[PDB]
Design a protein around this ligand. Structure first.
Ligand SMILES: Cc1cc2nc3c(=O)[nH]c(=O)nc-3n(C[C@H](O)[C@H](O)[C@H](O)COP(=O)(O)O)c2cc1C
Ligand SMILES: Cc1c(Cc2ccc(C(F)(F)F)nc2)c[nH]c1C(=O)N[C@H](C)c1cc(C(N)=O)[nH]n1
Ligand SMILES: O=C(O)c1cc(=O)[nH]c(=O)[nH]1
Length: 381
């Protein structure tokens, strides 16, 4: 861990736990984003093992760890976050018009249980301004050969007061879609009234098909233009993922799986935050969704259920409680092709990607796997 740029340089751990103990979470997160905006975060100088690469269709992840949605909501420090050692980032969730979200305080951390609860409310600058931030990343990427394989997806949602979610989803596709490697459809935030109701099978089917049709029309209507349409990493139209909430009964889970099979979604993000956790004293009488270690078992079990309900035909992006290489292998053996981190960055900080990639690599050795892909879904059978 040699010199200031190394993500494991000893000072970052001391700065981090001082922050966790004494500094409001909103301030800590703004500080992290400030360091990133001015490109003074440490960066991972390692070249990733080829034996831990993974793919979802034509998306070739250089390593299996990305940053989950809601961390860089406005796409203002994509480069710096990726250079910590992540292979991709999901920016968003964005909405057509900007919004400041719900009233504060709305973030609360519990270091002891490595857990967060939040009622943020899709605070973002709006689709149009976030699109400009992503365009600036894409121009830098075009000229920095070292970012040319990193992936950026965009999570899209609805403004709090919109009546038909589909209008807002189409609006985002038509402005930011051409710059995205994939689109994550967010029907699972706990903090926008009515949003989770769109996980009902009938509504969800119409949402998926409208989104895919809007993406396919983007292509049709611009194939012939002098500027190439897909200004992203893949140079292809974005894949479509759905992000699911873990607070569903089994019948809802089965009915959603049937819809995902029929609509040919490209992947599912399992899962968003949970409202079911009642046993954290810090968070008593607090509203919102719980992230972190106490979401791990819940979301891993959800991965197993959905891998089997979709008969292993729908690739899985794992989110929830991932801090260690063992955590990550649990998600992968459960059915996931790739992992997203959020809480790990809050409680482990700058070394998050370095550490968990090293832990996973050693673990793939100790368990005799030739590569990560061999481990996907191996819990089953
Ligand atoms: C403060 C905060 C804001 C979040 N915002 C979003 C969001 O805008 N869109 C989304 O899909 N998920 C959002 N999430 C959910 C995370 O992306 C992730 O799915 C969840 O926190 C579980 O992962 P973790 O246990 O590693 O933290 C947010 C989570 C937190 C803690
Ligand atoms: C601890 C932490 C870190 C790690 C870190 C920060 C500062 C430093 C420093 F030493 F260099 F300064 N090092 C490491 C990043 N983020 C948080 C955080 O607690 N975030 C809260 C939960 C939040 C608020 C919102 C919101 N409005 O979205 N979203 N998450
Ligand atoms: O912005 C938010 O409130 C939010 C969205 C989401 O999808 N998940 C979450 O935990 N918070």
């Amino acid at each position: 861990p040699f010199e200031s740029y190394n993500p494991e340089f000893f000072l970052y751990d001391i700065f981090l736990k001082f922050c966790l103990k004494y500094i409001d979470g909103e301030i800590c997160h703004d500080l992290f984003l400030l360091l990133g905006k001015y490109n003074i975060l440490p960066y991972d100088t390692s070249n990733d093992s080829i034996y831990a690469c993974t793919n979802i269709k034509h998306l070739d992840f250089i390593n299996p760890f990305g940053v989950a949605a809601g961390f860089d909501k406005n796409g203002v420090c994509i480069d710096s976050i990726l250079k910590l050692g992540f292979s991709f980032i999901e920016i968003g969730t964005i909405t057509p018009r900007g919004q400041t979200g719900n009233a504060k305080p709305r973030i609360f951390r519990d270091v002891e249980s490595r857990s967060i609860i939040n009622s943020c409310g899709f605070n973002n600058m709006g689709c149009d301004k976030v699109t400009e931030n992503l365009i600036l990343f894409r121009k830098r990427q075009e000229e920095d050969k070292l970012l040319s394989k990193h992936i950026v997806g965009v999570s899209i949602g609805k403004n709090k007061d919109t009546v038909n979610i589909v209008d807002d989803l189409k609006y985002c596709i038509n402005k930011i879609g051409r710059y995205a490697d994939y689109i994550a459809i967010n029907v699972s935030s706990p903090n926008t009234p009515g949003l989770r109701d769109n996980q009902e099978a009938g509504k969800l089917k119409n949402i998926i098909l409208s989104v895919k049709e809007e993406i396919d029309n983007l292509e049709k209507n611009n194939i012939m233009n002098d500027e190439f349409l897909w200004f992203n990493t893949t140079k292809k139209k974005p894949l479509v993922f759905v992000k699911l909430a873990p607070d569903l009964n089994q019948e809802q889970k089965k009915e959603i799986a049937d819809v995902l099979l029929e609509t040919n979604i490209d992947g599912m993000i399992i899962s968003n935050t949970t409202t079911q956790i009642n046993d954290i004293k810090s968070f008593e009488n607090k509203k919102g969704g719980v992230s972190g270690a106490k979401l791990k078992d819940i979301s891993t079990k959800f991965i197993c259920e959905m891998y089997n309900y979709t008969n292993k035909q729908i690739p899985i992006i794992a989110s929830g409680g991932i801090f260690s290489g063992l955590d990550a292998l649990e998600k992968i053996e459960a059915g996931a092709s790739v992992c997203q981190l959020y809480s790990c960055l809050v409680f482990n900080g700058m070394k998050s990607a370095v550490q968990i990639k090293r832990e996973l690599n050693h673990l793939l050795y100790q368990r005799g796997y030739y590569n990560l892909k061999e481990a996907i879904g191996r819990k089953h059978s």
